């Protein structure tokens, strides 16, 4: 079954929503920021409400703005893996990851794109100096993962392509 | 997870997935595939998803630690009798019965499947047995809130001292009934979940039809006509005396008025005056079959329609006139009755049945529990404004059904919860004498955005202050943008978030630089003025904010009309708890919504409504 980090988590869920076992985006925020931001080997103020809302959004296929526990376990897992990666690259523990290392970071993450997408991603999620922080690194990975998966989902047979109508599109990109 | 899961499911359904002939595979287990594996590996199937342990029994009344589960030994049929049979043909009666554990409403609902072969097959595959390709595995088909779901189970039945503790044949030889009940418990989480059941739900879940029920102490008029017309449609009628034997109505004639009663436990029947029927029994349950259920040449069937929808706190959860402020916000449907019911006695009209069943929710632990108080109103005659023939009937049942005979025309159906602000899903079905037309009544997708034409004009001061702000490149960044607007709006909500500003830039750039020029800053400023107006004119009580429910209004003013689903999406994603949408999110949504349309339009040159993307292009547009 599940594990010690999870049951401890399941705990917080029960107390918060009994048999509903779902969490709000702001509830999610409080939880994770009691866990990720509190360690001397990772400089971060934690995740922000917008980062959390996007987490709930990409993980919630019922349109209720509530994150389910099974979904949260999946998410946490990814967050722990990407957590390790962020440490491997925040060398001076500066709080961010240099603009030149990021491409290798996303690649250590399994996401193989091209120098242009990162020259789109970096520019889109970094601060003005060109560097990304823990919050944004995670935030960006959640979506890359979300959209990788959606693509697989709408491509049952494995044709390297998907077709979508205006309705499917607005849902796929609005709720994220 | 993700709406892409739902979007794939919808697609599958649109092609038959969920129909009786292509039943959804519960927990993805595929009967054959699992069977054949147990054969090759020469073993007897054991269900991973619904193991033979206490958890498959209960959690409270029948939970571990409880002295009711102490002693139970799961055993297969082959070990409880010397040649167990799945089903014995040539039956003229049934001998089903319960064990020490196991509800009685099951006898009733299960016994009713013994009267018609065709109705039993539908829910109990006939090509099964303990002889042929046996491997300790059986499947069954149940109807679930609209679609069919195939379930699998290993034949391990709970026993306590060589005696089934639930549903079993009296002669202890047949086993389909015991298995059908095991399966039904699985798809319900556990045997204990069946404790709070009701024959009407069983009838539905076992056949896929709609069930009218009548307390005989307050019968509707022309009941005898209803019964007679149901029997003609091959409907399943059952009656009883409740406060314990379930009988069925198998005949009704005028020669006086007579209804024939049959005991599924005898092989015999008998007639009685309609008068006695009305006085002896206390409940009549009519299970009205869908038109595909029976194939027996001409048995005369109903015409069926069914739709799906939901209610979501903050956007679509109003319901019940009593709440005029939100009522018009629930989903809305339209029924079109043409040909009337044929002659006989009473006046004219079109007969039809309407049922609204609320789908399963996470916290439902046992059947019949934590059910929402539902109901629906009907009105005689885009998405209808607060400017909106029966209605009423609001109970907390998993389904509310009303029978009607109305003059041919168009009516508007408004399903809803009693109180507003409650999340739940649902399915509506309409059974009718003659062909009727269903149709959703909602806003079609539309975006009509005002295209400002910057051009000359643009002031002297404006231009000057800009230059003294744009730096060497005469352009600013999303970061500089934030700070510039923060100062301005500082003098409602206190500042645009940095994500808001970045998407602004992605929208107005077009110069492909990551920065906004003078003309591009001008347009933004213009659009930023509009938003400020709209937001202001909605906040009629100057509170500095807006409420989730006003969004539909606001979107329309910004040039947008969207379907209920997208409105749910928008409030779920941008409104905070306590359904309030601040100004930053307010414009975030508008900018985002506009950019998403422009992009679709660019990727759809032919203007076809659908775009074809590959993996790499898909990631680029999904997140940039």
Swiss-Prot record, chain A:
GO terms for cellular component: calpain complex; cytoplasm; cytosol; membrane; plasma membrane. Residues 4-38, 47-80, 77-112, 113-141, 142-176 form the EF-hand domain. It is found in: Cytoplasm; Cell membrane. GO terms for molecular function: calcium ion binding; calcium-dependent cysteine-type endopeptidase activity; protein-containing complex binding. Ca(2+) 4 binds at residues 45, 133. Ca(2+) 1 binds at residues 17, 20, 22, 27. Keywords: Acetylation, Calcium, Cell membrane, Cytoplasm, Membrane, Metal-binding, Phosphoprotein, Repeat. GO terms for biological process: protein catabolic process; proteolysis. The modification N6-acetyllysine is found at residue 87. Ca(2+) 3 binds at residues 90, 92, 94, 96, 101. The contact of the 5th EF-hand domain from each monomer allows the formation of the homodimer and also appears to mediate the contact between the large catalytic subunit and small regulatory subunit for the formation of the heterodimer. EF-hand domains are paired. EF-hand 1 is paired with EF-hand 2 and EF-hand 3 is paired with EF-hand 4. The fifth EF-hand domain, left unpaired, does not bind the calcium but is responsible of the dimerization by EF-embrace. The first four EF-hand domains bind calcium, however it is not sure if the binding of EF-hand 4 to calcium is physiologically relevant. Homodimer or heterodimer of a large (catalytic) and a small (regulatory) subunit. In presence of calcium, the heterodimer dissociates. Regulatory subunit of the calcium-regulated non-lysosomal thiol-protease which catalyzes limited proteolysis of substrates involved in cytoskeletal remodeling and signal transduction. Essential for embryonic development. This is Calpain small subunit 1. The lineage of its organism: Eukaryota, Metazoa, Chordata, Craniata, Vertebrata. The chain holds residues 95 to 270 of 270 of the full protein.
From Swiss-Prot, chain B:
Forms a heterodimer with a small (regulatory) subunit (CAPNS1). Interacts with CPEB3; this leads to cleavage of CPEB3. One of its GO terms (molecular function) is protein-containing complex binding. Changing residue 265 to Y: 95% decrease in activity. Calcium-regulated non-lysosomal thiol-protease which catalyze limited proteolysis of substrates involved in cytoskeletal remodeling and signal transduction. Proteolytically cleaves MYOC at 'Arg-226'. Proteolytically cleaves CPEB3 following neuronal stimulation which abolishes CPEB3 translational repressor activity, leading to translation of CPEB3 target mRNAs. InterPro entries: C2_III, Calpain_cysteine_protease, Calpain_domain_III, Calpain_III, Calpain_III_sf, EF-hand-dom_pair, EF_Hand_1_Ca_BS, EF_hand_dom. This is Calpain-2 catalytic subunit. It catalyses: Broad endopeptidase specificity. The gene is Capn2. Residues 444-457 are annotated as: Linker.
């Amino acid at each position: 079954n599940e594990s010690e980090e999870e049951r401890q988590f399941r705990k917080l869920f029960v107390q918060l929503a009994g048999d509903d076992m779902e969490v709000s985006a702001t509830e999610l925020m409080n939880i994770l920021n009691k866990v990720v931001t509190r360690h001397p080997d990772l400089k971060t103020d934690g995740f922000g409400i917008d980062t959390c809302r996007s987490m709930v959004a990409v993980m919630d296929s019922d349109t209720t703005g509530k994150l389910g526990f099974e979904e949260f376990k999946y998410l946490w897992n990814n967050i722990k893996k990407w957590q390790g990666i962020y440490k491997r690259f925040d060398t001076d523990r500066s709080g961010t990851i240099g603009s030149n290392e990021l491409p290798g970071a996303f690649e250590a993450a399994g996401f193989h794109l091209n120098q242009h997408i990162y020259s789109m991603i970096i520019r889109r999620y970094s601060d003005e100096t060109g560097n990304m922080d823990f919050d944004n690194f995670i935030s960006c990975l959640v979506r890359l993962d979300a959209m990788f998966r959606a693509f697989r989902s709408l491509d049952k047979n494995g044709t390297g392509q998907i077709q979508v109508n205006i309705q499917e599109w607005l849902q796929l990109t609005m709720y994220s | 997870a993700g709406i892409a899961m739902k979007l794939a499911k919808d697609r599958e359904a649109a092609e038959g997935l969920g129909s009786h002939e292509r039943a959804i595979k519960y927990l993805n287990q595929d009967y054959e595939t699992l069977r054949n594996e147990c054969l090759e590996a020469g073993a007897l199937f054991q269900d991973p998803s619904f193991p033979a342990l206490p958890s498959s029994l209960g959690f409270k009344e029948l939970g571990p630690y409880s002295s009711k589960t102490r002693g139970i030994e799961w055993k297969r049929p082959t070990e409880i009798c010397a040649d167990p049979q799945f089903i014995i043909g040539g039956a003229t009666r049934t001998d089903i019965c319960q064990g020490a554990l196991g509800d009685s409403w099951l006898l009733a609902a299960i016994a009713s499947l013994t009267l018609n072969e065709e109705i039993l097959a539908r829910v109990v595959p006939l090509d099964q047995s303990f002889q042929e390709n046996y491997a300790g595995i059986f499947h069954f088909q149940f109807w679930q809130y609209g679609e069919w779901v195939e379930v699998v189970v290993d034949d391990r039945l709970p026993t306590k001292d060589g005696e089934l503790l639930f549903v079993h044949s009296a002669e202890g030889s047949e086993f389909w009934s015991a298995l059908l009940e095991k399966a039904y418990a699985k798809i319900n989480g556990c045997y204990e979940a069946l404790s709070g059941g009701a024959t009407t739900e069983g009838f539905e879940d076992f056949t896929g039809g709609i069930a009218e029920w009548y307390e005989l102490r307050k019968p509707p008029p022309n009941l005898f006509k209803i019964i007679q017309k149901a029997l003609e449609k091959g409907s399943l009628l059952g009656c009883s005396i409740d406060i314990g034997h379930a009988y069925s109505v198998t005949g009704a004639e005028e020669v006086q008025k007579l209804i024939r009663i049959r005991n599924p436990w005898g092989q015999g029947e008998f007639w009685m005056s309609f008068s006695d029927f009305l006085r002896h029994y206390s409940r009549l349950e009519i299970c009205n079959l869908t038109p595909d259920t029976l194939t027996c040449d001409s048995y005369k069937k109903w015409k069926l329609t069914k739709m799906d929808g939901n209610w979501r706190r903050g956007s679509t959860a109003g319901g019940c006139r009593n709440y005029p402020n939100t009522f018009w916000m629930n989903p809305q449907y339209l029924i079109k009755l043409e040909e009337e019911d044929e002659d006989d006695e009473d006046g004219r009209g079109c007969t039809f049945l309407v049922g609204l069943i609320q789908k399963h929710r996470r916290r439902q632990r046992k059947m019949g529990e934590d059910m929402h108080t539902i109901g629906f109103g009907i009105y005689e005659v885009s998405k209808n404004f607060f400017l909106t023939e029966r209605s009423d009937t609001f109970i907390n049942l998993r389904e509310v059904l009303n029978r009607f005979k109305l003059p041919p025309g168009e009516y508007v159906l408004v399903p809803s919860t009693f109180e507003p602000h409650k999340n739940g899903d649902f399915c509506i079905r309409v059974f009718s004498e003659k062909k009727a037309d269903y149709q959703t009544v909602d806003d079609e997708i539309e975006a009509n955005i005002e295209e400002i034409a910057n051009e000359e004009d643009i002031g002297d001061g404006f231009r000057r202050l800009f230059a003294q702000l744009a730096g060497e490149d005469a352009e600013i960044s999303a970061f500089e943008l934030q700070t510039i607007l923060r100062r301005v709006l500082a003098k409602k909500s206190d500042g645009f978030s940095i994500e808001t500003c970045k998407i602004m830039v992605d929208m107005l750039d077009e110069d492909g630089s990551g920065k906004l020029g003078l003309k591009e800053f001008y347009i933004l400023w213009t659009k930023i003025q509009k938003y400020q107006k709209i937001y202001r004119e909605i906040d009629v009580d100057r509170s500095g904010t807006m409420n989730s429910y006003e969004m539909r209004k606001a979107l329309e003013e910004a040039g947008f009309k969207l379907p209920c689903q997208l409105h749910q999406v928008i409030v779920a994603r941008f409104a905070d708890d306590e359904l309030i949408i601040d100004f930053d999110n307010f414009v975030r949504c508008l900018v985002r919504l506009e950019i998403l349309f422009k992009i679709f339009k660019q990727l759809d040159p032919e203007n076809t409504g659908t775009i074809q993307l590959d993996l790499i292009s898909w990631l680029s547009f999904s997140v940039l």
